[PDB]
Ligand binder design. Structure first.
Ligand SMILES: Nc1ncnc2c1ncn2[C@@H]1O[C@H](COP(=O)(O)OP(=O)(O)NP(=O)(O)O)[C@@H](O)[C@H]1O
Ligand SMILES: [Mg+2]
Lengths: 279, 282
């Protein structure tokens, strides 16, 4: 408990978070811990707060790592507090909802998809340079701002029965091989397909059949290949190479020509407006 | 929306009014009482609805008793009977069972299956992890999330449902299949009881699917250690030809079951498993 506490108390701030924040509202769904949205009473900034507390954790190290390493395209650590038999971690939050609501209720054009893909690749290049693998690049984990900001958020037994379909997972992942950061590039490709088709792949499959198809055939079958520009199709091909060596890195894909048709992020705000109206 | 209203409509809206057993996935499980009772909580589909409805409508002494359910939006609760003897997995994984103890478990499982199959229900997820044990050596089946309800109208399924290592070949290859898929899975559970693990467990789940699809009837590591009668029972459970494979009704009459010991013979296995688990944690 010594090492554990002391490191906290270096970084954790003094004060009562109960007075610094108002308008708490549950949204998680912790584990691990419970996650609320709330508002800074001094600045009006809206934040997300996770309250938790404990077998052990890297918690302190991640916390330390994320306080030292921030990036505009991820939701960043803001502050932390030890509150009684609890720990509170305060992180950034955005009010424009998830990419999956946009994907579900609108039809994105290639310029908008390129804008999103570019923001995500900026997050991924950053994370990968810090030896972090997200592992869950999917529309549910992309948060949008009212100004069109884009941030990544939220970053097994063989005997267990599979419940959800792990549609975003790379072949090397589903076949339980050793794997690296490029699994995130695969999931990005899947997410780009989701944006253009308006729903994730494998929707009509059992988890096991989907698992088999991913391992065996790799990329899902494009429902309507004719509809995509050559340059978008090239970008997808680069993301969804089954051979990890041939698959692009985040750094390389940042240079891809598809990203150069990206609209300004302001082009996403009409999509957020549609999605909120729809929901 | 529709499915969640359906779920809502099954649920009791009464006052549940908090010991812990262990936290699984989908979601985490807990102990309690009000008669000793076991309660599950989860906070999000049809699998839940199916499980609840199928359990409600198919009560039987060899099936874990469903009691009630209460939903709180957010989280959802399912209340079942508590079996304090743990799972058959703890036993096969930490102890050696004799043929008499194995026959006893097989008999009880076959009783559950004959009942389910007679009610047009296929379990599709038979494995030691889904067999729970009472402190008196009771043997009960759970986990009805993946069960299929068949009809003369539609008597077969073709979907890859189950857990790879226990799935029958006709299931993994997406052929039209029926209740006897459960008999295959029971045979694999018998292999767990002999060897500690189902075949191919060291392989990744997809490798296992391929091996099942290609190998068919799995081979024992040491067939010579088995009695001829036990070996015959296994052969009948794991026949590639569905027609030749035994039904639950048929296998209940098999000579292997005649050597079953009293269910009391299982409590020393439970004790050993408990002690082993304690060993593992320290
Ligand atoms: N009615 C019950 N009585 C006693 N123990 C139970 C009961 N139901 C579940 N358990 C146990 O409580 C734990 C619950 O976790 P759980 O996820 O339900 O099992 P698990 O199957 O091995 N994980 P999963 O593969 O996702 O189902 C397990 O260890 C079970 O053995
Ligand atoms: Mg189970």
């Amino acid at each position: 408990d010594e090492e554990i506490l002391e490191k906290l108390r270096i970084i954790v701030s003094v004060g009562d978070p109960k007075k610094k924040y108002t308008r708490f509202e549950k949204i998680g769904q912790g584990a691990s811990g419970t996650v609320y949205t709330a508002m800074d009473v001094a600045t009006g900034q809206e934040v997300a707060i996770r309250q938790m507390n404990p077998k052990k954790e890297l918690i302190i190290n991640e916390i330390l790592v994320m306080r030292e390493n921030k990036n505009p395209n991820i939701v960043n650590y803001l502050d932390s507090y030890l509150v009684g038999d609890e720990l509170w971690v305060v992180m950034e939050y955005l009010a424009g909802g998830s990419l999956t609501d946009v994907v579900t209720e609108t039809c994105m054009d290639e310029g908008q998809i390129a804008a999103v893909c570019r923001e995500c690749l900026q997050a991924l290049e950053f994370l990968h340079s810090n030896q972090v693998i997200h592992r869950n690049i999917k529309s549910d984990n992309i948060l949008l701002g009212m100004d069109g900001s884009v941030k990544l958020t939220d970053f097994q037994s063989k005997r267990s029965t599979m419940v959800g379909t792990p549609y975003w997972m790379a072949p090397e992942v589903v076949t339980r091989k050793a794997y690296g950061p490029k699994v995130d590039i695969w999931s990005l490709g899947i997410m780009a397909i989701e944006m253009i088709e308006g729903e994730p792949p494998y929707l009509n499959e059992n988890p096991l059949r989907a698992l088999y198809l991913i391992a065996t055939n790799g990329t899902p079958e494009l429902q309507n290949p004719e509809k995509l520009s050559a340059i978008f199709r090239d970008f997808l091909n680069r993301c969804l190479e089954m051979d990890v060596e041939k698959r692009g890195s985040a750094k390389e894909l940042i240079q891809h020509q598809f990203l150069k048709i990206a609209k300004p992020l302001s082009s996403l705000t009409p999509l957020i407006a549609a999605a909120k109206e729809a929901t």
